[PDB]
Each structure stands twice: as structure tokens, then as C-alpha cells.
Amino acid sequence: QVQLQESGGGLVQPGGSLRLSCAASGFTFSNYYMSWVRQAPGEGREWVSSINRDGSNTYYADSVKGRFTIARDNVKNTLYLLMDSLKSDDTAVYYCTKGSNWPYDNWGQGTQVTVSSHHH
Amino acid sequence: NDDVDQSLIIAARNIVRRATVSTDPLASLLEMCHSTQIGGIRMVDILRQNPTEEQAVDICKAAMGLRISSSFSFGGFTFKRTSGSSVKKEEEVLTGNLQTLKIRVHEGYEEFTMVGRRATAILRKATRRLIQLIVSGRDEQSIAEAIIVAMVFSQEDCMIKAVRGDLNFVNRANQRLNPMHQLLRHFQKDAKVLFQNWGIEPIDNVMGMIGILPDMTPSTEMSLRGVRVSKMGVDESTERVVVSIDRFLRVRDQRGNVLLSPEEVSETQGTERLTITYS
């Protein structure tokens, strides 16, 4: 029973920062690439970043390169996405997934990230 | 240096788009290249030495009379033929919406690697028939794009008959794309009828591979005929050849095959990280 549970999303203003976490359970987290995939309103699910098994190699979509950092804790079996300099076009549900390519073996449910100057 | 490649691509894309709507796109393309600086660097000086391979960049190089890769672009994917041969044969085909199209049928067995920015695939095809497509990518839309391009490129009758509207797609000069791109744009807008009529087949459970159904759901037992998704990843040797380029910025090799055109230049536009002066 693989389980992926994202958290840490929410409302922030353009340029702000967020730290997304993804708790993994039900498999040997250490032996799999992990990825983040996002879906903006009215669009399709789009790959964001991937991290190899021990975290020594990272991969980023060019739209988030230099602003997001992917990382993992193989002892606690948790994946992270550290988001700096957030933009309005970063608004989306962010999904934790198991594996490096589509179709990913498992998906989390996603946590909502809303980057906006007009909410409160 | 990677900042130079990135800004070179943005500059070439903007220059190619602007030239397409000119009365002399070729003459206007060249004067713009010679008039643009990237980070204080003459664009022509970069074009003469930078080895970045991108559709707009190579259209500029072709206009400058320089060599470019022998591979052709279709649907944004670089097609590199690894085996086989083909002879082009004019055929009148009937679309599913009862219009005629004169297409140049690739008659022969051929194997290609397709290298996209977000997807990679191995393609084997015969005359108007897709034999095998092994595709990899990091999201659904990226894999769907590759599958669509391969189905259209195969020129299968089932793909012609899956059209459901009149094909009136035009370039930015308000002008009909050639028949292959008419079909591509149609299914890029919506590929549900294409997928639903392509057909499925039982597949053998092979390590690191998975089937993909018409609704783009993964499956372990069936898959779109000839298509498989490699979760392991498909891993891609460029020959630079002399090309011709015409007043519509269509680039051809010395046997008349169109390698590049403005419609093969990405509509994407990042933000240049080095300043671009169009003096």
C-alpha cells in the first residue's frame, strides 16, 4: 500500500517562499527516483523536478530552475520542494510522485499552491 | 556561455517570426541577424561559432548560408534516421471530413529517433503504417505530443480518416500549411478521435515498459497498437550539411526534403538572461 501525502502548500504573495513536503510510506523510498508534478488551473499536469535515489543528482524544468530546489530525506522517507521567488504562474496543485518518468508508479493527492497579491 | 545559448534562441525565434510576415522574409531575416546584439555580442558572430541546435537558430544559419544538422523537424521533434530508406510518392488522400489532400508519402521501411525537448522516442515505420513507437517522457502531455506526431508522421489511413473538421491552418502570413502540418495541427488541437480509432493490441509484460490506452491511462495488458511507454527512458551524432532556404523560410536538404520552417519553431518564449538589442 504505497502512500504519498503532500503538505506545506497554501497562499503566498509573488516573490514569497514555500516549503513543500511529501511523506512516503509503504515502499523502500531509498530505491526510487522521486519527482514533483504540478497542474495549473485549466491546464495539464506538468513535470517540475526529479531527484535520484541518494539525492546527488537533481533535475528541473527550465521554468523553475534557479528558484526551486528538490531534496529528499532517505531516513525519514520524505520528499521536499523548496520554492523561492514564487511567481503567479507557479500557482498550481503540486503532486509528489514515485519514479522518474511517466507513468509514475504512484501519485500523492497534491497540495494547493496559490501565488497571488490579492487573496488574504 | 549557457546564458548565450539561451538568449541566442530567444533572439532567433523573435527574428524568424518577424521575418515571416515581411515582403522578403529571407532578406529581412538576414538584415535583422546582422543588426542584433546579444550581451553586446554581434548575433552573426555567435551564429558562426555557437553549436546550439534549435529550429529558429538553424533557420538563421541557413539564411546566412551556413551548414546545419541533416535531421528534419516535425512537431517540434528532431527526427534522426538511423536505418532504412524511403522514396516520396504523391498520393491523394481523403480525410475523415471528406476533403482531399495531396501528401508526399514516404514509401519505404525506416527507423528514426525522435528527440523532443520534453520527450524522446524510437520509431519504426513502413509505408503508411506505424510499426513500433517506444516513447519516454516526464509527464502525460509530453508523451501525448510524441505519440501524436508519430501517428501523423506515419501517414496511416486511420489517422487521415480520424479528421473531423476542415483543415484551414495557416502560418502567420495567413497561409495554408502544407498537408502534413494540416494534419498535425488538427490532432494537436484534439487527438481523442485519433487515439480512439487507432486500435489497441495485447502486449507482453516486459520489464521497464508499460502500455498506454487511448484515454492515456497506463495499462499492463493492452496498449495503442505499436506503442509502448518506456519508464526507463529512451536515450538518444549530428551531420552538418549544406541546405537551401526559400522566400517562405522553408529549409531543404539537397534532395528536396524540408528540414525546417517557421511552423517548426516553438511558440514558447522565455525571458532572455542577456540583453538583446535589435539595433
Which characteristics define this entry?
heterodimer; A: 120 residues; mainly beta; Immunoglobulin-like; seven-stranded mixed β-sheet; four-stranded antiparallel β-sheet; globular; B: 279 residues; alpha+beta; eight-stranded mixed β-sheet; three-stranded antiparallel β-sheet
Structure description:
- The complex is a heterodimer of chains A (120) and B (279).
- With 120 residues, chain A is mainly β.
- Chain A has a single domain, classed as Immunoglobulin-like (Sandwich), CATH 2.60.40.
- Helix content of chain A is 0%, strand content 48%.
- Chain A has strands at 3-7, 10-12, 18-25, 34-39, 45-51, 58-60, 68-73, 78-83, 92-98, 106-107, 111-115.
- In chain A, strands 2, 4, 5, 6, 9, 10 and 11 form a seven-stranded mixed β-sheet that branches. In chain A, strands 1-3-8-7 form a four-stranded antiparallel β-sheet, with no helix packed on it.
- Chain B is an alpha+beta fold.
- Chain B has a domain at 71-231.
- In chain B, 28% of the residues lie in helices and 30% in strands.
- In chain B, the strands form six sheets. Chain B has an eight-stranded mixed β-sheet, with helices on one face. Chain B has a three-stranded antiparallel β-sheet with strand order 2-1-20. Chain B has a three-stranded antiparallel β-sheet with strand order 17-18-19, with helices on one face.
- In chain B, helix 1 packs across helix 4 and helix 5 packs antiparallel against helix 7 (179-189).
- The longest helix of chain B is centred in the N-terminal third of the chain and has 19 residues, at 2-20.
- Classes of the chains: A mainly beta (120), B alpha+beta (279).
- At the A-B interface, strand 5 of A face helix 5 of B.
